[PDB]
Amino acid sequence: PKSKRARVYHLIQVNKKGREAKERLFSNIRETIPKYQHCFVFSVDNMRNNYLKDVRHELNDCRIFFGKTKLMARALGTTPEEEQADGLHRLTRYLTGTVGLLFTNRDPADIESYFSNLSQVDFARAGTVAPRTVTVPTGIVYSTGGEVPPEHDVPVSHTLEPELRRLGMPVRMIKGKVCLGDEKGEASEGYTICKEGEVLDSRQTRLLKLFSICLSEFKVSLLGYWNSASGEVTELEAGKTRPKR
């Protein structure tokens, strides 16, 4: 009946895709399966995963798929009656959560070497434990939160003033400059964004991102793979201990 919220109709150029997208994902995965000798299942647990683009650009000759886990699992076939190939229903067992597929014509040892030597510093992301205590120095605040030397830093922006206040930093707008306390930095104690051994919240993570401070690591875990020639799945060290389907 009445007394309902008004959903906004967005004046937008791109709309929802739905069934056609699901079908083209099935079609792409199924046409990719016969082309490649091995299919790796990898996991990216609590990372931002924007470096997957660099991963693709490095592994151009390998096809990486990162879609919905259930759609990918059924595209490969969850049961040994609807499986496209042998053992693929045993790899859909490793397709559990925030995971992805990597069809390769390469060597498993080379793939594991690459994915063990690839490692990129990245922003904290919520739920991670703090390795160190980040504190914003009292006084004039800069674009790094007192991590780089202050002499080598630029003042933070007055358009970031309100966002910082919303995120909870008791800052002020003094003579065109954002200041925590006063410009003397003698009337207020600093602001500790995160403390050691404390699970970070989204507020703290967003503050760290705004101050351009990275506390987490981007690394891809390789749970297992499947060889088409043997039609066989191999369990790797990471996939030994992960909530399975």
Partner: peptide, 30 residues
């Protein structure tokens, strides 16, 4: 409110059409 709702509905319809898709003054002036 009637005018606003008519304008909003016209805008929505025109936008949907355009997203799906990929003289008397002259004589009087003379």
């Amino acid at each position: 409110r009637h005018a606003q709702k008519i304008q909003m509905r016209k805008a929505i319809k025109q936008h949907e059409e355009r997203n799906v898709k990929g003289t008397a003054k002259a004589l009087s002036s003379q």
